[PDB]
Design an enzyme around this catalytic site. Structure first.
Site, PDB file in Angstrom:
ATOM      1  CG  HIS A 104      -1.841  -1.086   1.365  1.00  0.00           C
ATOM      2  ND1 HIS A 104      -2.849  -1.387   0.460  1.00  0.00           N
ATOM      3  CD2 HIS A 104      -2.008  -1.913   2.408  1.00  0.00           C
ATOM      4  CE1 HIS A 104      -3.537  -2.422   0.921  1.00  0.00           C
ATOM      5  NE2 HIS A 104      -3.004  -2.805   2.061  1.00  0.00           N
ATOM      6  CD  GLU A 141      -5.277  -3.339  -1.965  1.00  0.00           C
ATOM      7  OE1 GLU A 141      -4.249  -2.707  -2.312  1.00  0.00           O
ATOM      8  OE2 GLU A 141      -6.134  -2.867  -1.148  1.00  0.00           O
TER       9      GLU A 141
END
Ligand SMILES: [Cl-]
Ligand SMILES: [Cl-]
Ligand SMILES: [Cl-]
Length: 193
Positions: A104, A141
């Site tokens: 992330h 993602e």
């Protein structure tokens, strides 16, 4: 099991890149980044400082991940969560391998956006994550609406797999295999990216 701090020179952008572990002394700075308009839609941590402190403390005590600050010429300007897929929510969405990792990230200060600086930073941290011998795949993602990051990830070797209906977003699951990454990292360093 934590991702180690590191410092590298990047000859393409002619900058010193350095990554260090986040500490509780970073809470005010990180809280400010979480209130940036370009970050809020994807992170949803534009919350009171008291709450952000409690959250950051919990994440710093979480054993499946490493929080880092990335800096260019010593100026801190990016936040990173490096994690093991096996202990993460994303493990539920694809047939992960034991040592798969995820990432992330965000660029905080506006003064570090729009200059192509995400590439050398992301390539550097990916390279250091891939030095885990049994890790062959790194996943991401991004929110499916974050076209810029999906593009950046593709340019770094990530292949889109499918959407993932996560609690906080519809993400685009993307996988980066190490052999593909090393070719892209070498392209970058050889001025052929
Ligand atoms: Cl170096
Ligand atoms: Cl270099
Ligand atoms: Cl995103």
């Amino acid at each position: 099991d934590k991702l180690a701090p590191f410092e590298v020179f990047d000859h393409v952008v002619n900058k010193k890149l350095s990554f260090r572990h986040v500490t509780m002394d970073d809470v005010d700075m990180l809280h400010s980044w979480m209130h940036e308009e370009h970050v809020i839609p994807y992170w949803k941590l534009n919350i009171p400082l008291v709450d952000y402190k409690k959250h950051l403390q919990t994440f710093l005590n979480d054993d499946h991940q490493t929080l880092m600050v990335g800096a260019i010429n010593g100026v801190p300007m990016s936040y990173w969560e490096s994690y093991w897929v096996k202990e993460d929510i994303i493990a539920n969405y694809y047939p992960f391998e034991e040592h798969d990792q995820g990432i992330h990230l965000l660029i905080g200060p506006q003064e570090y956006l729009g200059q192509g600086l995400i590439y050398p930073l992301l390539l550097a941290i990916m390279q250091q994550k891939f030095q885990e011998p049994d890790t062959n795949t790194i996943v991401a993602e991004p929110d499916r609406r974050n076209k810029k990051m999906i593009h950046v990830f593709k340019k770094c070797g990530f292949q889109p797999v499918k959407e993932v209906e996560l609690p906080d977003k519809i993400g685009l699951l993307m996988k980066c295999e190490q052999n593909v990454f090393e070719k892209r990292w070498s392209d970058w360093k050889m001025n052929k990216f």
